[PDB]
Design an enzyme around this catalytic site. Sequence first.
Site, PDB file in Angstrom:
ATOM      1  N   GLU A   1      -1.009  -5.342   5.055  1.00  0.00           N
ATOM      2  CA  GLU A   1      -1.998  -4.270   4.481  1.00  0.00           C
ATOM      3  C   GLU A   1      -2.913  -4.141   6.481  1.00  0.00           C
ATOM      4  O   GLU A   1      -2.812  -4.946   7.337  1.00  0.00           O
ATOM      5  CB  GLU A   1      -3.136  -5.201   4.337  1.00  0.00           C
ATOM      6  CG  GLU A   1      -2.972  -4.057   2.803  1.00  0.00           C
ATOM      7  CD  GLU A   1      -4.221  -4.511   2.145  1.00  0.00           C
ATOM      8  OE1 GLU A   1      -4.273  -6.008   1.508  1.00  0.00           O
ATOM      9  OE2 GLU A   1      -5.329  -4.371   1.461  1.00  0.00           O
TER      10      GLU A   1
ATOM     11  N   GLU B   1      -2.809 -10.452  -7.331  1.00  0.00           N
ATOM     12  CA  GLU B   1      -2.678  -8.957  -6.097  1.00  0.00           C
ATOM     13  C   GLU B   1      -1.475  -9.751  -4.951  1.00  0.00           C
ATOM     14  O   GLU B   1      -2.204 -10.745  -4.449  1.00  0.00           O
ATOM     15  CB  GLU B   1      -3.428  -8.591  -5.657  1.00  0.00           C
ATOM     16  CG  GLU B   1      -2.818  -7.565  -4.748  1.00  0.00           C
ATOM     17  CD  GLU B   1      -3.988  -6.491  -4.343  1.00  0.00           C
ATOM     18  OE1 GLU B   1      -4.928  -5.914  -4.898  1.00  0.00           O
ATOM     19  OE2 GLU B   1      -4.438  -6.346  -3.772  1.00  0.00           O
TER      20      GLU B   1
END
Length: 232
Positions: free
Chosen positions: A120, A115
């Site tokens: 974020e 990932e």
Amino acid sequence: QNWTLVWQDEFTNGISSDWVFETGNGNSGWGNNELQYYRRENATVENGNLVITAKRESIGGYNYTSTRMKTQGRKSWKYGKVEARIAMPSFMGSWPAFWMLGDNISSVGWPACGEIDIMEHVNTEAQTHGTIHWQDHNNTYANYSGSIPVSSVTSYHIYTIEWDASVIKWFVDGNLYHEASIANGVNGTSEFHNNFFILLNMAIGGNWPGFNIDNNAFPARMLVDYVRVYQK
Ligand SMILES: [Ca+2]
């Protein structure tokens, strides 16, 4: 440093057919105890921007709705410069993200597929994070993360990774803040030498942001001007 554009979604009038949408709360809140139920209706295009709107709405036993969309099964890349110009909300419980997963999640699962979180943000933090998650050579979940101060995440900023066979580099507005070597699969990083697809979402609640939700922040809009992929 010569990049060629190989794919984009500029969202000029609509969402391209390169995007697939998730529905619902998944398994244990998408694996992170998230509180939202994803829907296609929460994604719109206005004035040349993708709008992901999180709402306080009851559906399927859940109290929030939002969008999780991906290029899985449509478009994927091995190496390149991946970037998006995003303006996101800042409120308690918010969890916007721009990220990638290995195409082989369907056969090896998570986190072995790998990932790359290009961007974020959680809650009202005055910073954003760039992270890789994977399963190392000792069969253990591994992650490596970095952050950069961003005073106005509500304004548009450019979130980018540069990825090659040796390294992944993270930037905001061209400012380098995180780097991870994947050279020769060091630290068990062999799965980063494979095709990855792109995801966009805004989650509400979860293990990292927590469960204190500012219910007066709804409806909340995550705006994406564009997503672009360049390669050498
Ligand atoms: Ca646009």
